């Protein structure tokens, strides 16, 4: 049911969309906090569609999107598993994320760099979900190290304070 596969690939594309908007000059013109909050909202709905599927009948989908290196015997490829652990968590995580970004807009209001803060939060979500749905462990590693680095960037948001740096 492509509806299932496409949905699992689509959540990643929709969440990556806020990241490259800030890459281009477009974010100055639209509102980044409102736009990001809406897209996570839509990602949660997109996540719900596979969740209902899995409930209908228990099917687990391994999706090998891109090949990265043959590396002789050990071929390396980008694979997202859609086992019960992955899609159940994907839905719960985005709901929490949808909650926090709205909270973030109120909490960090008056921060001069709200847009960068929202940007890193979604990058965290992208690494976290990659960590969730990772078939080969190399991708699991990309997620494991990836949340570590962005946590470093986000724990010490206020770099000036040495306590945050420590």
């Amino acid at each position: 049911m492509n509806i299932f596969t496409t949905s699992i690939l689509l959540i990643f594309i929709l969440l990556l969309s806020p990241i490259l908007i800030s890459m281009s000059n477009l974010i100055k013109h639209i509102n980044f906090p409102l736009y990001t909050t809406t897209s996570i909202k839509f990602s949660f709905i997109i996540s719900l569609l596979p969740l209902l599927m899995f409930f209908h009948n228990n099917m687990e989908y391994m999706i090998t999107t891109w090949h990265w290196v043959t590396m002789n015997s050990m071929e390396l490829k980008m694979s997202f598993k859609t086992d019960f652990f992955s899609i159940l968590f994907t839905s719960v995580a985005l709901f929490v994320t949808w909650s926090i970004m709205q909270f973030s807009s109120w909490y960090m209001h008056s921060d001069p760099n709200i847009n960068r803060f929202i940007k890193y939060l979604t990058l965290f979500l992208i690494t976290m979900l990659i960590l969730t749905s990772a078939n080969n462990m190399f991708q699991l590693f990309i997620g494991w190290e990836g949340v570590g680095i962005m946590s470093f960037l986000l724990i010490g948001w206020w770099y000036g304070r040495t306590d945050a740096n420590t």
Partner: protein, 94 residues
């Protein structure tokens, strides 16, 4: 206590800080500058589908599932067979 002179330095330098902060204030005009939902949910979608139904689907072992968890007495659409039912356990006693 406040050394007489120390309270004339803090007297005066506070007076200057008050002027600096006034000057920091921006004059009017100071800043002189010189459904869509479907947009990024549908447009991204068509592409993904294009990719998943015409590359992945086409290539071997790219989207693999598990079985459909057939239960006793439920029919198999593709072959036409009807799964044989279980035995008649009469334990009850619930």
């Amino acid at each position: 206590g406040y050394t007489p002179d120390e309270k004339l330095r803090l007297q005066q330098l506070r007076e200057l800080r008050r002027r600096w902060l006034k000057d920091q204030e921006l004059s009017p005009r100071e800043p002189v500058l010189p459904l869509f939902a479907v947009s990024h949910v549908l447009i991204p979608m068509w592409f993904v589908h294009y990719y998943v139904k015409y590359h992945m689907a086409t290539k071997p072992y790219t989207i693999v599932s598990s079985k459909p968890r057939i239960f006793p007495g439920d029919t198999i659409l593709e072959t036409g067979e009807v799964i044989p039912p279980m035995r008649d356990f009469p334990d009850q006693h619930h």
